[PDB]
Amino acid sequence: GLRFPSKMFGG
Amino acid sequence: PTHDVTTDRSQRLTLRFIPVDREDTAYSYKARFTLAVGDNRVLDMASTYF
Amino acid sequence: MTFEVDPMDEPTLLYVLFEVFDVVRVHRPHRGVIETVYLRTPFSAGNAT
Amino acid sequence: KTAVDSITQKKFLCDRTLWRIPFSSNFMSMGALTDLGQNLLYANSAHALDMTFEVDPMDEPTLLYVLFEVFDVVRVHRPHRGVIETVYLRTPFSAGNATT
Amino acid sequence: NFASLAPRHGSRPFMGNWQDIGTSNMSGG
Amino acid sequence: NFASLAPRHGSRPFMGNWQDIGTSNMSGG
Amino acid sequence: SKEIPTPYMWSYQPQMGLAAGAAQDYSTRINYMSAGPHMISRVNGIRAHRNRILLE
Amino acid sequence: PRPPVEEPAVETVSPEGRGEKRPRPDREETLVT
Amino acid sequence: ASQLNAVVDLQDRNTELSYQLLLDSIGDRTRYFSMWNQAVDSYDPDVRII
Amino acid sequence: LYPIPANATNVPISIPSRNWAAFRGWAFTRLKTKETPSLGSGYDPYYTYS
């Protein structure tokens, strides 16, 4: 959903 | 009786219906028809046959 | 039910006619609509609500 | 350096599968009972269907296996000991009212 | 409520879900 | 409270599940 | 099915003189799987008018 | 280690994390368990 | 436009024997009608009972 | 199973006329007549393929 945190490299 | 029994318009007594889709198996065959009864016509299914 | 028959040297079948009321009521409320309801009692095919 | 003049032949092989064409308004599986099967154009009216398949010619008598996808449903009732009653219904291509 | 038929994880029954009682498995949809 | 020790997914502390507090695994049990 | 159910008809046992046990009236059911809303609604009003008689 | 669980006590299996058809890859959106 | 088959046919019905016993009740059965191939099976009584 | 002749390119099929309520879609694949037994028969004597 909209609560899933965004994909970043290493965090 | 004269009126309100038999129409004056062009209308067939007996109709001929072509099989719209015939499916033939080795042990049976299926014949599908369009039995179209038009407006202001009645069909007793005793008169229908193959 | 218990049927005692004469013996035969052949496989035979016993064909019992459980006499019912195999009755159909037919409604055609609109053009090209053919609605049928079947009831037979006591050996019904069956339909719930 | 002595390569000949060459042309490219492209193709694909897709084994084990069935070419699905869903009867939906956006070709997406948003449910089995699709929005076009529920559409009142295709629900209260009758329509002919004429499909036309253009295939590669083969040197052998072949067949065409079309899945007209339906709802082949069976509802099973056991009301008493030893009694097994079933009601069958598939739509669209109905065999009919196959109650037992 | 048939909760004595469920395996107790701890002190509470491990009941299933309501929405898992049916099936919708069908080829292509 | 102990909820300021959790990473904040948004403005809410991302608290772990209550079901992950104990272990239950054995050799087929 | 819940609103208009099928009645549980009782099985008699002539020896003990008690009822054996009740199963639903599956054998007197009426088949409207080939009917439409002009006639399914009329049969469901007969399933319910029968259930009012049995409570009466 | 354990499938997801709601707590209404009774202990009810939660349907979260199950696989679905999605137009976008499900790992960049959710955690799939 | 209906998908609503008026023929609800069962295995423990006998439509053929229902039609053989119907024609006995509604008319003379010894008479022959070639259109429905209506010619009833009749043994010779001198052959069966000598 | 609609038959395709040898070296035939266009395969016209025809579902005649029907209500299409609760229709889900199509899925199609060409087969071989040698590799497909005429099922519905208890024995296919013209099926020389295993």
Structure tokens at H7: 């707590």
Q: To the nearest whole angstrom, how far is the Cα of D99 from the nearest Cα of chain G?
A: 9
Resolution of the coordinates in A? 3.2
Residues of B in contact with J14 (CB under 8 A): 21
Does C36 lie at the interface with G, CB-CB under 8 angstroms? Answer: yes
Cβ-defined contact of D65 to J29 (cutoff 8 Å): yes
- Using a CB-CB cut-off of 8 Å, the residues of chain J touching I3 are 18-19, 21
In terms of Cα–Cα distance, which of D94, I4, D78, J22 is closest to C48?
D78
Phi, psi values for residue D2, rounded to 5°: -105, 40
Inspect the structure and tell me whether chains B and J have 3 or more CB pairs less than 8 Å apart.
yes
> Residue F19: CB partners within 8 Å, gap ≥ 6?
H2, H4, H5
Closest CA to E26 of G32, J40, D37: D37
Largest CA distance in chain C: 58
Q: Does D20 touch chain E (CB under 8 A)?
A: yes
Distances (CA, A) of E6 to E1, E16, F26, G16: 10, 9, 19, 39
Overall residue count recorded for chain A in this entry: 11
Q: How do the residues of chain C divide into helix, strand and coil, expressed in percent and rounded to 5?
A: 0, 20, 80
Are D36 and D45 in contact by the 8 Å Cβ rule? The answer is no
Query: C-alpha angle with apex H11: H10 to H13, nearest 5 degrees?
Result: 140
**Which tokens is C46 given?**
């069956």
Contacts of D39 (CB under 8 A, 6+ apart): D25
Asked if the peptide bond before residue D92 counts as cis, ω within 30 degrees of 0, the response is: yes
Does any CB of chain C come closer than 8 Å to the CB of residue G16? no
Q: Please answer yes or no on whether H10 and E9 come within 8 Å at the CB atom.
A: no
- The beta-carbon neighbor of E13 closest among H6, H10, H15 is H10
Nearest to G31 by CA among C47, I1, J37: C47
- Residue found by looking up tokens 């939660």 in the block: H14
Spatial separation of the C-alpha atoms in residues D26 and G52, rounded to whole Å: 49
Cβ separation D22–E27 shorter than 8 A: no
Q: How many CB atoms neighbour CB G45 within 10 A?
A: 11
Question: Nearest chain D Cα to J31, which residue?
Answer: D63
Cβ-defined contact of B27 to J41 (cutoff 8 Å): yes
* Closest by Cα among B6, B28, C26, F21 to G38: C26
Counting one residue from G and one from I, how many pairs have CB atoms under 8 Å apart?
9
Nearest to D32 by CA among F9, E24, I48: E24
- Which residue bears the tokens 């006590």? H9
User: How far does the CA of residue J42 sit from the closest CA of chain D (Å)?
Assistant: 21
| DSSP class of G42 | H
Please name which of C25, C45, C44, C46 lies closest in space to residue C35, comparing C-alpha atoms: C25
Task: Report the chain G residue with the minimal C-alpha distance to residue C27.
Answer: G39
Strand blocks (E) in D39-99: 46-54, 62-69, 73-77, 85-89, 98-99
In one letter, which amino acid is G31?
A: N
Residue ranges of the alpha helices (H) in chain D? 40-43
Buried b (16+ CB within 10 A) or exposed e, I11-39: eeeeeeeeeeeeeeeeeeeeeeeeeeeee
Shortest CB distance from J33 goes to which of D18, D51, D62?
A: D62
Q: Which of D25, C44, H28 is nearest to G24 (CA)?
A: C44
* D and I: number of Cβ contacts within 8 A: 18
Q: Which two tokens stand for residue D68?
A: 């007209």
